[PDB]
Amino acid sequence: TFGSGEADCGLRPLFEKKSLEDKTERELLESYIDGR
Amino acid sequence: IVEGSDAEIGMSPWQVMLFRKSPQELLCGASLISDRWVLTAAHCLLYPPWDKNFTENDLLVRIGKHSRTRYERNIEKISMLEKIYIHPRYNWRENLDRDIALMKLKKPVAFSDYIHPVCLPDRETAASLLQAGYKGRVTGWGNLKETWTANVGKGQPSVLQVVNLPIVERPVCKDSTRIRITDNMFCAGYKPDEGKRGDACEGDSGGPFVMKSPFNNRWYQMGIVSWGEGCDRDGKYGFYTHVFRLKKWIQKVIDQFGE
Ligand SMILES: *C[C@@](*)(O)[C@H](CCCNC(N)=[NH2+])NC(=O)[C@@H]1CCCN1C(=O)[C@H](N)Cc1ccccc1
User: Fold this and answer.
1) How much is the CA Rg of chain A, to the nearest whole Å?
2) Residues B143 and B190 in one domain
3) In chain B, at which residue ranges do the beta strands (DSSP E only) sit?
4) Which domain of life is it from (chain A)?
5) Do residue B188 and residue B232 come from a single domain?
6) Burial (CB count within 10 angstroms: exposed 0-12, middle 13-18, buried 19+), residue B112
């Protein structure tokens, strides 16, 4: 099956876990199609 | 990384430093995809042209690092390797096609605030999100400039460096170079008329190109730093191994054996 432990992958302890944004993170979001 | 900036602590908890034993040398970046599996570029390990052939025990993997050079005492984890698997159709002779290798760690790492796996993309997420103009992020400890030729500035960062750049469309990728481009490669970077700059560079290979899904909000690794021609040159683009096109092989070696 998996070789793994991960499955909470891509959520980052000091940031999404803590409901925090990194300092240049809204930029990539802003490219996805544009914003709003 | 050229034209990037210092990383916040914990912002790339998947970043992995591939580190040579003797002589102590940074060689490449990598990424944590699981507590036992690390993904990188195959050319970091095997590139016969430059007489390059690392085996499982020429290398350390350092996980949870921020500083390029200091031991971070209760943050970083130094691990040793069990197995290296390089794509059997990796083409080192011509264009670096299928620039991917897996590393099975010898025992598992435990996740902390500093150490946390990235997701690999599924069909719908690779489709959704990898469209020209969409931005991703590259991290590494690699060159700040081109150091093979005389240049001003430090060549080497003290802290992990972050750059956020756009996917460029294949037409443009293919005419910025005379190296043969492939479906397993994408390019990314700013056009000369876009005002902004930045790129990977030598030392950055193996590091992830990641993207934050607006749906669930999980970061996914979309590419691996592969090749380029200089660093940040106008009209040139960084080329990246296309992780989703190679996920069949990843899955097939990861799941091969049980735990
Ligand atoms: C191994 C990696 O550190 C490195 C990353 C360079 C990224 N550069 C930019 N601007 N984004 N890759 C390499 O240096 C590879 C390995 C072999 C040499 N090489 C090159 O990128 C050459 N610059 C171009 C090349 C030569 C032969 C075959 C393919 C590409």
Assistant:
1) 14
2) yes
3) 5-6, 15-20, 25-32, 37-40, 46-47, 52-53, 59-63, 77-79, 81-86, 101-105, 135-140, 161-166, 185-188, 208-212, 219-227, 238-242
4) Eukaryota
5) yes
6) middle
Residues B134 and B21 in one domain: no
**CA proximity to B257, closest of B55, B41, B42, B104:** B104
How many domains does chain B contain in total?
2
Q: Do B116 and A32 touch (CB under 8 A)?
A: no
Rg (CA), chain B: 17
- Is B79 in the active site? no
Instruction: Say if residue B147 is in the same domain as residue B240.
Output: yes
| Atom of ligand 1 lying closest to residue B189 CA | 11
* Token pair of B252 as six digits: 């097939």
Resolution in A: 1.9
Chosen from B6, B8, B125 to mutate, greatest number of chain A CBs within 10 A: B8
Structural domain harbouring B258: 13-117+245-259
For this PDB entry, the determination method is: X-ray
Provide the residue type at B222 as one letter. Answer: M
Asked if residues B224 and B99 have their Cβ atoms less than 8 Å apart, the reply is: yes
Are the beta carbons of A6 and B33 separated by less than 8 Å? yes
Q: Does the active-site annotation cover B99?
A: yes
